[PDB]
Design a protein around this motif. Sequence first.
Motif, short mmCIF file in Angstrom:
data_model
loop_
_atom_site.label_atom_id
_atom_site.label_comp_id
_atom_site.label_asym_id
_atom_site.label_seq_id
_atom_site.Cartn_x
_atom_site.Cartn_y
_atom_site.Cartn_z
N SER A 1 0.81 33.73 0.41
CA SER A 1 1.99 33.26 -0.31
C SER A 1 2.36 31.85 0.11
N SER A 2 2.87 31.71 1.33
CA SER A 2 3.24 30.40 1.85
C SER A 2 2.02 29.68 2.41
N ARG A 3 1.11 30.45 2.98
CA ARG A 3 -0.13 29.89 3.51
C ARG A 3 -0.90 29.14 2.43
N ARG A 4 -0.87 29.67 1.21
CA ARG A 4 -1.54 29.04 0.08
C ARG A 4 -0.77 27.81 -0.39
N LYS A 5 0.55 27.88 -0.30
CA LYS A 5 1.41 26.75 -0.66
C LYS A 5 1.13 25.55 0.23
N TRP A 6 1.00 25.80 1.54
CA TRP A 6 0.62 24.75 2.48
C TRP A 6 -0.76 24.20 2.14
N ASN A 7 -1.72 25.10 1.94
CA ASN A 7 -3.07 24.72 1.60
C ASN A 7 -3.11 23.77 0.41
N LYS A 8 -2.80 24.30 -0.77
CA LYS A 8 -2.86 23.51 -1.99
C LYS A 8 -2.14 22.17 -1.82
N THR A 9 -0.95 22.22 -1.23
CA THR A 9 -0.16 21.02 -1.00
C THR A 9 -0.90 20.03 -0.09
N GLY A 10 -1.44 20.54 1.01
CA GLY A 10 -2.18 19.72 1.94
C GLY A 10 -3.41 19.07 1.31
N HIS A 11 -4.18 19.87 0.58
CA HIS A 11 -5.40 19.38 -0.06
C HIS A 11 -5.10 18.21 -1.00
N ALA A 12 -3.95 18.27 -1.65
CA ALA A 12 -3.54 17.22 -2.59
C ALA A 12 -3.28 15.91 -1.86
N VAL A 13 -2.40 15.96 -0.87
CA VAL A 13 -2.03 14.77 -0.11
C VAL A 13 -3.23 14.21 0.64
N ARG A 14 -4.11 15.10 1.09
CA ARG A 14 -5.33 14.67 1.77
C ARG A 14 -6.31 14.03 0.78
N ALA A 15 -6.37 14.58 -0.43
CA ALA A 15 -7.23 14.04 -1.47
C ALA A 15 -6.91 12.58 -1.73
N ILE A 16 -5.62 12.27 -1.82
CA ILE A 16 -5.17 10.90 -2.00
C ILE A 16 -5.72 10.02 -0.88
N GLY A 17 -5.68 10.53 0.34
CA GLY A 17 -6.21 9.81 1.48
C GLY A 17 -7.70 9.55 1.36
N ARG A 18 -8.43 10.54 0.87
CA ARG A 18 -9.88 10.40 0.70
C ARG A 18 -10.21 9.45 -0.44
N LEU A 19 -9.30 9.36 -1.41
CA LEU A 19 -9.47 8.44 -2.53
C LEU A 19 -9.02 7.04 -2.11
N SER A 20 -8.15 6.99 -1.11
CA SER A 20 -7.60 5.72 -0.64
C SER A 20 -8.55 5.03 0.33
N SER A 21 -9.84 5.31 0.21
CA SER A 21 -10.83 4.51 0.91
C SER A 21 -10.85 3.17 0.19
N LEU A 22 -11.54 2.19 0.78
CA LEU A 22 -11.54 0.83 0.26
C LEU A 22 -10.19 0.17 0.54
N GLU A 23 -10.21 -1.07 1.03
CA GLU A 23 -11.46 -1.79 1.26
C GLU A 23 -11.86 -2.56 0.00
N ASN A 24 -11.49 -3.83 -0.06
CA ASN A 24 -11.77 -4.63 -1.25
C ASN A 24 -10.88 -5.85 -1.36
N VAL A 25 -11.51 -7.00 -1.49
CA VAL A 25 -10.82 -8.25 -1.66
C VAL A 25 -10.74 -8.52 -3.15
N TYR A 26 -9.53 -8.48 -3.70
CA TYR A 26 -9.34 -8.71 -5.13
C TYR A 26 -9.13 -10.19 -5.41
N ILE A 27 -10.05 -10.78 -6.16
CA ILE A 27 -9.98 -12.20 -6.47
C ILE A 27 -9.41 -12.45 -7.86
N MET A 28 -8.46 -13.38 -7.94
CA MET A 28 -7.92 -13.84 -9.21
C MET A 28 -8.06 -15.35 -9.28
#
Lengths: 385, 385
Positions: A1-28
Amino acid sequence: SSRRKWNKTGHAVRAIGRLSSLENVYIMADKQKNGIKANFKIRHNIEDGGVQLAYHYQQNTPIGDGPVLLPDNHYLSTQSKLSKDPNEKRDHMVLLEFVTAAGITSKGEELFTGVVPILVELDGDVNGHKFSVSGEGEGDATYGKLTLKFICTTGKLPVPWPTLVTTLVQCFSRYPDHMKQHDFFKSAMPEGYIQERTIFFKDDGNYKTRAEVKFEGDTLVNRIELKGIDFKEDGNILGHKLEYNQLTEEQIAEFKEAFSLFDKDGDGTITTKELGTVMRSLGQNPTEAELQDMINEVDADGNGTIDFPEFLTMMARKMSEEEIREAFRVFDKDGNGYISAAELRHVMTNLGEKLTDEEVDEMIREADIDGDGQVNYEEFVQMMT
Amino acid sequence: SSRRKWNKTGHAVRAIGRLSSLENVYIMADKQKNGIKANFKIRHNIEDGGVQLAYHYQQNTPIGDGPVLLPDNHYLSTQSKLSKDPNEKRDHMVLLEFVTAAGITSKGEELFTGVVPILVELDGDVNGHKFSVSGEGEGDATYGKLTLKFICTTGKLPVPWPTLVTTLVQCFSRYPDHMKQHDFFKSAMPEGYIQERTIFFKDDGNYKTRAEVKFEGDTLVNRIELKGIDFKEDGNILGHKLEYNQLTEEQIAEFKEAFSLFDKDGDGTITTKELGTVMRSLGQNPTEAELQDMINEVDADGNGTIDFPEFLTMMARKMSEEEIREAFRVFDKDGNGYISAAELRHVMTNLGEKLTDEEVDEMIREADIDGDGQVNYEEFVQMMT
Ligand SMILES: [Ca+2]
Ligand SMILES: [Ca+2]
Ligand SMILES: [Ca+2]
Ligand SMILES: [Ca+2]
Ligand SMILES: [Ca+2]
Ligand SMILES: [Ca+2]
Ligand SMILES: [Ca+2]
Ligand SMILES: [Ca+2]
């Protein structure tokens, strides 16, 4: 019940972290100054735990009065590697860098056709602490390769080497064929350009840099002025709390020549043509779509071909020995369980390699354990471990 | 000298192997039959070592007489997962599949808007061995999701389950918005289509299949005819030498709802819009280029957005706890070292979740070890392990 709520919630916030790799010089582009602007962030890992964030703001301007290539929006992708020279008693840093341009779907270029000698001179002052750094090395725009060794000429470096990395030559960046019209850095040479930066170290001080990047002969030079202020005595910078350190140098060289097997015209990349050509020599036959799909598989940035860095990140991995047995099948054309000096010669030749008969025999001898003049599986395996 | 020759040489041949991943059904149009054709290969891992190769040749044709969407060259990308039901005494197979269309840069579609019940009936004969398989399950074209359980109704399956996988409904494939004009499979329903295949198992026999895929009501049905010949009694197929078996079912479900946090319009994908929206709720602010670069980072196939499979392959990985401390910072807005029921409620709400106050307290209680009514770091960490 709550264990799953923590899980799903954690995986989401962690996913953002895994997507937040880079790293990148943006040139304009900046027309107001016949130059370019850029901004990016660096995560400096802290010894013990945590991440020191450094926000960079960059502005470039031609030194000369000639025409300049103003680029459309794109970014630089870079890999850094710090190490030490065991024989160096001075405060120093060895650096390996791979820069590549991306984000898109002249005369000063021929200056970077081969290996270009680099010289960097740094004069900085952080919280009243004066210091000086100087580095010798070379650049290879063909691979966006960058290798230098910096030494502190004032004694002990007041700040962590990692913080000076971004400050210590984007003209060696590797621009794809379809983006060589957006390479401001090279179109500025030999006269060169001015690079200004403000770097904000969150919860700490900031750097202000001004550098001249130009040709002083055949040598590409980077004369830098730096000023750091508002740094805390107990902060991560003045407190030296950032980690310094991943492959070996010579190790990487091996992959370099391996890569050079595919890259047969030494332009620094592997096209579907060059790839297919190799696989076909090895008795394989991929279709056009397969070739494209294979490259697109490891071409994360999306330039088009396969860069040395990509080749590098792919070959580093680990896990799954199957690839070895598969590699054995490639050598063993008749498939009888042994690799002969002939079959070995046949593979070498196919890959486009010029090995003699004493040299091939030498290879056999280096793996032929039972001395049958061949190389069976159990020896092929141990030979690759 | 020779040691390096082996190295460089090995790395090259191995690199080809690492590039030779995939895996991919290449679809071409066939006007002569108002249908499509395809071909691909499957590597069946052998128990003990090795890889059994199966070359597939596929031909599709509409059953009805209505208009049909003829696609341009593209491919299907698929993930399979086999498992067993501990309570099943019959010879059976549980299957989880994720199919997605790619390779490009109507009416029968609304039929696959929600979950569609699937029924598969197989009648096969390999080397005179008659058998029958039947499977119940459901498909979700929105995720290209496919989940079924097959049972052998003739007793013991004469061949390995893995070999029948490709034979046992590409109409549940997930076509990107910009490719929904190349979806032949759905534009054929309800009348459905005919799928014929010849499968060549290298150094062994071959399968010949003919299947009807159509709507028998609201149920999507797959009636198959199979015939295997020339299989060796001591071969990998009749000899049952191929491996059968990676996450848990319920495990994957967790990532499903995590994914559903980002995918707020339940179209099965995450756009840069939906991504940015989430990060902004969590107090972060990425630029447009960053959002695009983040997605392009894990969007290997190159469709555009982020598919559930991609989300899945990303969340599975391992290594680097830093992401946890980072996740803690996200929960702890004021940054004092503790997560309060309020801050926890604030995160839930931001992610667009409707949790009560008894439920939130329940979550706290599930991690609050010292009972201070909060959640400190050492508990947040242990709570996620
Ligand atoms: Ca090339
Ligand atoms: Ca590339
Ligand atoms: Ca042989
Ligand atoms: Ca031997
Ligand atoms: Ca969506
Ligand atoms: Ca995608
Ligand atoms: Ca707090
Ligand atoms: Ca607590």
